[PDB]
């Protein structure tokens, strides 16, 4: 039950945004998706019905990233107005707001345990904050410039990130630096545990990294050895995620296409003409046979899996 893959036409094509789209994510519990836009706004929709639910406005500058706790209550957002906003997804109100990043903050991520939140910003530093207080408890450093995005591993002991220095760094709450990309690195994805068998056929932990080279790479975290390199995207890579079972990798690039890859065979299988313009983000529903893609074109498309 790990082989439902997106296919056209889309289940829904929602065009409510007044500006381009920066992330799209599903709620852990309720059948709703949430997306952030360049208009300093977040939008919550129902993907099953394709009907607008609401808008958690409050930010001043472009909201670039959003993340959820597993419990589904606390929602994190970050924007270019120097701030990180934590919101009650039940009451639809900004619980609190944190400041301290010296310039635009690109990415945030609520840890699965729901006790702390990590943030990456243009000032080449990563900051770890208390979810319930908003106090900067930790500050990892060492990047030369913009930390484009940060992600913690499943247990949160280990954190990985990608910057413009082409050096995907991994460190414990530096353990490794991966520095053989040819260009800036946009997106990463901690590989799921379910891939441990399949990759053993294809060949930890195991880490993805998509870059402006049109090259997605899977890597060994413990040893840092580049394990493999999927190529075939016709433009910059912007998003990469594994299938639920670890049998396929879905990726999004600025080639106006969403690709589904079998990494065991090391080849593309499926290609979806997602949007007429740049595809900026994607996400895989953990259980349901649906996925989501958000593009520069202001349209969020919910794709049906068969």
């Amino acid at each position: 039950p790990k082989e439902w893959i997106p296919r056209p036409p889309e289940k829904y094509a929602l065009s409510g945004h007044r500006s381009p789209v920066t992330r799209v994510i599903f709620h852990p519990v309720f059948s709703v998706m949430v997306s952030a836009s360049e208009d300093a706004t977040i939008k919550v929709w129902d993907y099953e019905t394709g009907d607008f639910e609401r808008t958690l406005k409050g930010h001043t500058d472009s909201v670039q990233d959003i993340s959820f706790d597993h419990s589904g209550k606390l929602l994190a957002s970050c924007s270019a107005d120097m701030t990180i906003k934590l919101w009650d997804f039940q009451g639809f109100e900004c619980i609190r707001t944190m400041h301290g990043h010296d310039h635009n903050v690109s990415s945030v991520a609520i840890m699965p345990n729901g006790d702390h939140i990590v943030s990456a910003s243009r000032d080449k530093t990563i900051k770890m904050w208390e979810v319930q207080t908003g106090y900067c408890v930790k500050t990892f450093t060492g990047h030369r410039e913009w930390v484009r995005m940060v992600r913690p591993n499943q247990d949160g002991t280990l954190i990985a990130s990608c910057s413009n220095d082409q050096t995907v760094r991994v460190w414990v709450v530096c353990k490794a630096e991966l520095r053989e990309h040819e260009h800036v690195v946009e997106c990463i994805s901690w590989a799921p545990e379910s891939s441990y068998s399949s990759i053993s056929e294809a060949t930890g932990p195991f880490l993805l990294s998509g870059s402006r080279d049109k090259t997605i790479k899977m890597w060994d975290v413990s040893t840092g050895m580049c394990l493999m390199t999927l190529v075939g995207h016709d433009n910059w890579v912007r998003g990469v995620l594994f299938h639920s079972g670890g049998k396929f990798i879905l990726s999004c690039a600025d080639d106006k296409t969403l690709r589904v890859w079998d990494y065991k065979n090391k080849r593309c299988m499926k290609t979806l003409n997602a949007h007429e313009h740049f595809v900026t983000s994607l996400d895989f529903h953990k259980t349901a046979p649906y996925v989501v893609t958000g593009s520069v074109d202001q349209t969020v498309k919910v794709w049906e899996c068969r």
Binding site: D61, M82, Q166, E182, H183, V184, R212, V231, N235
Partner: protein, 735 residues
């Protein structure tokens, strides 16, 4: 197939034996002979825009122009969001240039030479192409007392950053630092071999060996000998480093550089980046003013077309004619400086940034004047609708006939609004052309330029109004009176200069022989706490950030000692860190106030300027003309002979001034006070007292007529006696 091989063959032909040609005849020759040899040796093979790129696929594929334009526009929006955010329009040949710099950055040792006119974007385009190719950009900075040791330190630091750290680096620079004699040797060696001996001596050699050890360890190769590690360092420099030199199209400079640097013309790749062709001017004018409502359905075509851009549509549209005139007013500056060179004067460089500011001023003036004119017509409508209500509803008849003249004037102004919409575009065109192109000319040549522009527009049947002065349109009475109160001479030329110093797109130079313009510009902006310094002042380095952070305007003199550290300020290479605006100076990065302007002035009026300042600064000339000199020639002689008559003349002129202002204020108060009430005017009785109290204060017009009669009858004592003396003495001054 075979055809694809022919395509790549022809593309390499056109990118090796057409990029370095100067004139268009040579390019036509190359293209036509490529066609003939293709026909001869191989009996859509030759689609006109041979184009190849790797940005629509993972490898080197043919591409089409439209989707390439869309892609580069989106990627340039991302670039705006990331680095600079300077609005750049996309014309046709810029795509060709972008693909060419991309191709050379792909090649190892991809060094470039770009022969281009200053101001044509040969630096920022290269930065833009370098950004998406993972290529960081390092630009040299020039300060006062710049020596070769500082440049050597920069070269050491960056060679470490490119060799051992193993990050790809590009060097986009121009003549600014290259002037010194010691500069040329290091590049002559570096572009040739990739290694410059006698540069890393001392402890620098030891520490760069130490850094190369860890660099090689990270790469995965074990090296433990100094010479082989140095060879690896050299190979890494070959791998990573790129150098782009940008030069002006000077024959003497080209010959000197070919003599003193053969490797610069042997190893680098040549591109005659050149100046913008008329096709590029047409494209920029069309696309930058595409959003504006310059459409006239009732445009009638004349029989004779003044053609300055070929391949025009046979039936031209109104916007097409306007942009044709925009091309003409740029070729006219070429003709004017050709004349000024032939006569023996001093000519300034003709750069596309002049044209860009011309189009920007066109759009700005068009918007502002259309808005103001529509707003005043709205006031006219509501005033007429409030007077007609009064008519529909004795002291009322007295109050209705009291505003009879105002009603007549407003009703007469109403019906000519269609003609005022008709001639907004041409008037604004001539105004913007005078703002941008006529910065560095005297009165006679300015009049010649305006006359030629008027003749061209009349030949094209473009509607414009000639019964309006240049200074009257761009400035109203209030600011003119403020300027006259700010020690500005009362003449048309200095009026135009004050219009330049207030309504501009670029930061200006002032060409003043006497320094009176310095006093005028100090008094004008005195409310904003103006301060003055100079380039040679040692505290100017301290004063720059003090002016920039708090937004206080800064006045800087002696620009013949120009410091290039202001280059980011002139180009406005700003960034937005959310709620703050940040600027760079090479040494430090500082905030900017939203309201800030720097004033530059020149003392010697005959200084020839290098094109780097010519392309990025506008000009104003505080010269002296015939009637201008006659003015103070009559004032001085009258003061010397008859102090009483001069005092009377000054008092009469002054009293004319504020009373004209009072008349204008009364008209405005009678218009706005009439509109800002909805209660039927007749019903309101507080209203009648104020709206017939202000019409009664308009009887000071007869007093104004009284001192008008006095001044025009008492001036015959002077103007009929000192006229020949003033004329002869002005002729004496110019002789």
């Amino acid at each position: 197939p075979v055809e694809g091989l022919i395509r790549i063959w022809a593309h390499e032909a056109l990118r090796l034996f057409q990029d370095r040609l100067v004139e268009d005849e040579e390019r036509r020759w190359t293209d036509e002979n490529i066609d003939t040899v293709a026909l001869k040796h191989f009996p859509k093979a030759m689609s006109r825009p041979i184009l190849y790129s790797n940005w629509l696929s993972k490898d080197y594929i043919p591409v089409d122009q439209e989707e390439l334009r869309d892609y580069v526009k989106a990627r340039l929006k991302v670039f705006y969001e990331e680095e600079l955010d300077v609005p750049l329009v996309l014309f046709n040949e810029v795509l060709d240039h972008v693909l060419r710099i991309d191709r050379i950055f792909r090649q190892p040792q991809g060094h470039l030479l770009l022969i281009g006119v200053s101001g044509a974007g040969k630096t920022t385009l290269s930065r833009f192409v370098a950004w998406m190719n993972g290529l960081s950009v390092y630009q040299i900075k020039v300060h006062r007392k710049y020596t070769g040791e500082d440049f050597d330190e920069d070269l050491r630091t960056v060679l470490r950053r490119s060799g051992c750290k193993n990050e790809k680096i590009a060097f986009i620079m121009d003549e600014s630092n290259v002037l010194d004699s010691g500069f040329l040797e290091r590049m002559n060696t570096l572009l040739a071999n990739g290694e410059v001996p006698g540069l890393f001596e001392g402890d620098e050699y030891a520490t760069l060996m130490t850094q190369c050890k860890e660099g090689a360890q990270k790469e995965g190769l074990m090296l433990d000998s100094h010479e082989e590690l140095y060879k690896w360092f050299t190979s890494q420099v070959i791998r990573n480093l790129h150098v782009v030199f940008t030069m002006n199209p000077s024959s003497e400079g080209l010959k000197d550089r070919a003599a003193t640097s053969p490797a610069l013309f042997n190893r680098c790749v040549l591109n005659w980046f050149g100046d913008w062709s008329t096709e590029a001017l047409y494209q920029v004018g069309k696309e930058f003013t595409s959003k504006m409502d310059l459409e006239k359905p009732n445009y009638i075509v004349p029989d004779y077309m003044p053609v300055v851009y070929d391949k025009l549509p046979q039936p031209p549209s109104h916007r097409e004619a306007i942009v044709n005139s925009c091309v003409f007013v740029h070729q006219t500056l070429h003709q004017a400086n050709a004349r000024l060179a032939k006569r023996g004067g001093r000519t300034m460089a003709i750069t596309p940034r002049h044209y860009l500011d011309f189009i920007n001023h066109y759009a700005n003036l068009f918007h502002e004047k259309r808005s103001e004119l529509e707003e005043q017509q709205m006031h006219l409508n509501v005033g007429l609708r409030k007077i007609k209500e009064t008519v529909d509803q004795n002291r009322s008849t007295a109050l209705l006939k009291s505003l009879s003249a105002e009603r007549e004037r407003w009703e007469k102004t109403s019906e000519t609004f269609k003609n005022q919409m008709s001639t907004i575009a041409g008037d604004c065109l001539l105004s913007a052309a005078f703002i941008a192109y006529a910065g560095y000319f005297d009165q006679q040549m300015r009049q010649n330029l305006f006359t030629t522009w008027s003749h061209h527009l009349q030949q094209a049947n473009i509607q414009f109004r000639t019964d309006i002065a240049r200074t009257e349109y761009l400035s109203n009475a209030d600011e003119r009176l403020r300027w006259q109160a700010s020690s500005l001479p009362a003449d048309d030329l200095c009026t135009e200069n004050a219009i330049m110093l207030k309504r501009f797109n670029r930061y200006p130079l002032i060409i003043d022989p006497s320094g009176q313009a310095t006093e005028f510009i100090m008094n004008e902006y005195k409310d904003r706490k103006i301060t003055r310094t100079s380039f040679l002042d040692d505290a100017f380095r301290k004063n720059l950030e003090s002016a920039l952070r708090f937004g206080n305007p800064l006045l800087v003199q002696d620009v013949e000692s120009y410091d290039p550290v202001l280059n980011p300020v002139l180009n406005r290479e700003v960034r937005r860190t959310g709620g703050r605006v940040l600027i760079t100076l090479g040494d430090q990065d500082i905030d900017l106030s939203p309201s800030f302007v720097i004033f530059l002035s020149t003392r010697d009026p005959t200084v020839e300027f290098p094109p780097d300042l010519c392309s990025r600064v506008t000009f104003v000339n505080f010269t002296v003309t015939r009637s201008s000199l006659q003015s103070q020639c009559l004032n001085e002689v009258l003061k010397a002979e008859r102090p009483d008559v001069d005092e009377k003349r000054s008092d009469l002129l002054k009293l004319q001034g504020e009373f004209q202002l009072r008349l204008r204020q009364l008209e405005k108060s009678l218009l706005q006070a009439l509109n800002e009430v909805k209660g039927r005017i007749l019903d309101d009785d507080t209203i009648i007292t104020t709206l017939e109290n202000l019409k009664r204060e308009a009887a000071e017009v007869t007093r104004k007529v009284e001192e008008t009669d006095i001044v025009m009858q008492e001036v015959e004592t002077v103007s009929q006696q000192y006229l020949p003396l003033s004329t002869a003495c002005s002729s004496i001054y110019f002789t």
